[PDB]
Amino acid sequence: PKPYVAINMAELKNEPKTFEMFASVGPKVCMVTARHPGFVGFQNHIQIGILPFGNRYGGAKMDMTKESSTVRVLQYTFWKDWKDHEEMHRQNWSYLFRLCYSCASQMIWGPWEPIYEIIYANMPINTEMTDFTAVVGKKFAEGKPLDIPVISQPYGKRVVAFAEHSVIPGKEKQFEDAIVRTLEMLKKAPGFLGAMVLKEIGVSGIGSMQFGAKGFHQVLENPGSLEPDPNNVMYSVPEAKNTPQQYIVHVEWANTDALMFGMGRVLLYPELRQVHDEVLDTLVYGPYIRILNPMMEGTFWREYLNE
Amino acid sequence: PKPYVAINMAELKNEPKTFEMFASVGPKVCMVTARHPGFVGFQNHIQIGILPFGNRYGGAKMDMTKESSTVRVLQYTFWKDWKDHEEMHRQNWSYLFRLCYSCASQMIWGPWEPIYEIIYANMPINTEMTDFTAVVGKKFAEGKPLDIPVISQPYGKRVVAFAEHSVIPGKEKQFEDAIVRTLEMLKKAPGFLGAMVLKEIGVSGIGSMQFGAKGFHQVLENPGSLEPDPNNVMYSVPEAKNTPQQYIVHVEWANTDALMFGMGRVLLYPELRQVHDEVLDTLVYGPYIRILNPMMEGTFWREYLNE
Amino acid sequence: PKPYVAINMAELKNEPKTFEMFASVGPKVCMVTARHPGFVGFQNHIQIGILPFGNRYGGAKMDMTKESSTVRVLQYTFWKDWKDHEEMHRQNWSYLFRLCYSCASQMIWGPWEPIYEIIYANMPINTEMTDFTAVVGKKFAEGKPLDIPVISQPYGKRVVAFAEHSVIPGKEKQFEDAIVRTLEMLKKAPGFLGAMVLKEIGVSGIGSMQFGAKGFHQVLENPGSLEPDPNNVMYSVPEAKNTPQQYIVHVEWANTDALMFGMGRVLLYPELRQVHDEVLDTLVYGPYIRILNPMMEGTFWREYLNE
Amino acid sequence: PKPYVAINMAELKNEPKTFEMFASVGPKVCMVTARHPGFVGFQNHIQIGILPFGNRYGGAKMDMTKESSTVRVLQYTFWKDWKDHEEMHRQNWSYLFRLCYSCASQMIWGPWEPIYEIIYANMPINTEMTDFTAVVGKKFAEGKPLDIPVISQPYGKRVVAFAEHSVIPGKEKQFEDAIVRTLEMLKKAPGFLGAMVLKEIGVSGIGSMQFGAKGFHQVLENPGSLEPDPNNVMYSVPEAKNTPQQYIVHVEWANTDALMFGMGRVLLYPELRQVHDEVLDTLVYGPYIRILNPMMEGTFWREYLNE
């Protein structure tokens, strides 16, 4: 079934010390997260660049890693029920907070952790180039050759287009119908590895280190080994849901060229352009498209998805 | 069905500033072109070199990019009807002309834009290496394994042999029959990714910036933001059709070695050599073979082709 | 009388080895050509640049020799009858072919050798600065001071504007009348050293190394000392004549500034601009203007011209 | 059917000038060779190294290209009948000799051109990685999945083990039976791309530049453009056949590691070792194994083979 998605967003210094701390702390955070039976996996992204749309963002490019002074991370964790995410944080607060605190010296912005429901998903399981033979064999054996997926390689060997949209209040349904039609047509593009639409349902105060006065002081005054009061979060997930409604259109591609011209199909192919125009008419903001590298992931979330 | 092909040809300075302007302007031109419902896609080529034919052109080689002071571009746009191309230019003149003008500082020759009908096509859809599993699965599911194409990777991950021919008046049919037989046999060569024969039907004056006196002065005197009178083109497409008849034999290959020895098959394999000799007997000019890299493309033109 | 003109065109690597082979082979080719009594001289050009027309060809300039990776040559040979050119090639094939073959290692494109009739000529004999005193003295002695020509120095000490035009079918007469009027007025410009209009009547297959299948294989397989069958040319000169009709407007100037502003007179002097506009209205292609340096020449062709 | 094989062997200076002359002359020679209807293709090899057999040849290694002062070439040409090879040389002597003469400045040893019959062949057609999808599709379509070959990439993208053997007179049959059994078992090794056994039937004097006194003087005294008397070869092909009998065991592999451990299977796998021991017992000389790179080839010889 469709899991809920929590996305922890942050901006840190782009220097080796930052990536060294990803390697030490990241695995720990994920392992603590896996303590909860509602946890169904994760997909961690590093932003490598921005889609320039010609020169609409002429100062940007798809790979800005060599020039950029900061690095932005977007950590997806997948949950049977979004409430599981909230429960996980509170049950494992002592570990989580102290782990995330060691990121402090590198933090510029964040963490900010919106929660999303998936209202549309066309996402295959990941496979390495070594696996396709067995996958093909098995699917033919069981008479389901139509279930043979594209090869979507895990661990930094494909790229993601992360497309931000905010929609005019009252136009949500028009956006949702048009985006689904758009993605259903978009899957014909070469190198297309899947897509899903995320609809924000709220924000996790605890995951965003957003407490009341008490917790705020505890955060600011912390030596690193004392938890803020996890009950000092002053709002529930839904209370923080944004209006205008926010969506993420998440599309995966074989490489940055397939991404560039693939996403471009909604602009270059007249038939698809007409359909995608219905999406554009509903927007307050966007589309703004970040290029992401899914470096670290628990691929089994797609197994939960496709069962 | 078979679309018509417009090929915008130009020669520019081989320097970074030239490629920077491709990235800013190219996408825009393509997007304006897609405004017309007759537009069915594009395939943009950079010439990387010339086929030396041993040492017949001993100063040349397949990859001359590192030494060359100029770059030649050949932009294919595909059209349901060639008249659509002409209509598109005129309907969107304000945008098109001002966009193509920003190429000015880099121009050495061109633009020159002949129009072609396709009289023969054996061209598959493009696919990335990640797609073949799903393509195989789908074709077997629908009982059409014979429709499984070779893997013809988009976005600069294959090469094109662009073979110029002009034919002795009265020998057109002999050329056309012999070239089709040749290409039907040539498809056995390893790394063969498809072929098509383009027959020139005329030239687009408006696409070639070839106006009467009035438009010419407007072009030369332009600050960049004023259009020449698009009605000052003094000839129709067919009026500019060349005699001797011109053809392009367009053949795609996995790599430059497969191209070199593949094209060479018409010279090295006695059986095919005899057939290809019938082509040679009809020529006023050629064969002259440019090596092209199809870097930017709207792959969906092949979908229109193969329906 | 007016001779016919054969122009051998080729593009070679711009490196010392190329010019070294000009000095060894060129003289030989010219000496073999002089075996035929119909040969009345030659004028060999190196292209040094392209007229930018402001920034219409902004990447170009009049002298591109220092930056260019290639060099283009245009070798005019002059003939009492164009048939003499064809006869010369065949009578001296063994020498000619083997000589032109040694250019192989430097060839990028060509050779291509169109033939032209001169439909208008205002071209003086060449003289060195040392000669004018005797020329003046002689002309006054014989009572013909009006026959004292401008000083048109031979051997790379002046420059040529080589203006390509292709004309809309049915507009040839309008072009020819308007171009003659244009050149008759243009001769008032400072530094004007003469002009002529060349009208293509066909192409020499043998001079262009364009044979049937048999000759083509012989060319490609040649060790350098075996002639292709000179009777394997499959078309006559006129059979290759182009439609749209092609013309060369050949204008000579004291220097590149006199050329730039001189040619510019058809754009800058209202009276002449009106007349030249009639030329512009007839064009399919052009004007495209190459800057040439006439380095090596047999000046006596002008003696034949002006008798 | 099984073609006959001529192998032109030579040793030249390992310097750029040598490879430059391969690119100019090689294509010509192969094109002249293709004049004969008995010509069914070629496979040209550069020796990159020697199989060291542990340290039996401790001074050698599989890739010696960076250190070696010479380069050895082995050019296979394939023929319907070995007599076709002899006829081809004589019919095209003037071209062939003059072409092969330009190699002179680089020659250290050779040319030497033994002729061979194929007494065993397990060799697939070549295919590029882009082709396998269509090959798979076609073979399943025609109900022959057993005829789907390994992917044996052409043009320098695989390697060859060239194993020299000479056999004790009277032991030929034992050698032939044991080598076939060996190769039938060897095909199980990973990366195995095919094998064949060549049995020498003679030597081509004309291909080896081995004439009588008259031809020898003509060779030594040649300016480069005069043929030795091709009728001055003093022996027929079979008259030069060697005793002890010579064989080449030609095995192709995905890469040098697969080659090393693959060939090693006859030494490391007890079962296969016992069988291969029967080969060893028959030998006067060998096995001596050269590592070859098949850079230039006419892949269609395998099409003739497998029909």
Ligand SMILES: [Fe+3]
């Ligand atoms: Fe969280």
Ligand SMILES: [Fe+3]
């Ligand atoms: Fe156009």
Ligand SMILES: [Fe+3]
């Ligand atoms: Fe000539």
Ligand SMILES: [Fe+3]
């Ligand atoms: Fe031979």
Ligand SMILES: [Hg+2]
């Ligand atoms: Hg993690």
Ligand SMILES: [Hg+2]
């Ligand atoms: Hg943090």
Ligand SMILES: [Hg+2]
């Ligand atoms: Hg484009």
Ligand SMILES: [Hg+2]
């Ligand atoms: Hg332009």
Ligand SMILES: [Hg+2]
């Ligand atoms: Hg000369």
Ligand SMILES: [Hg+2]
């Ligand atoms: Hg030449």
Ligand SMILES: [Hg+2]
């Ligand atoms: Hg060859």
Ligand SMILES: [Hg+2]
């Ligand atoms: Hg030789």
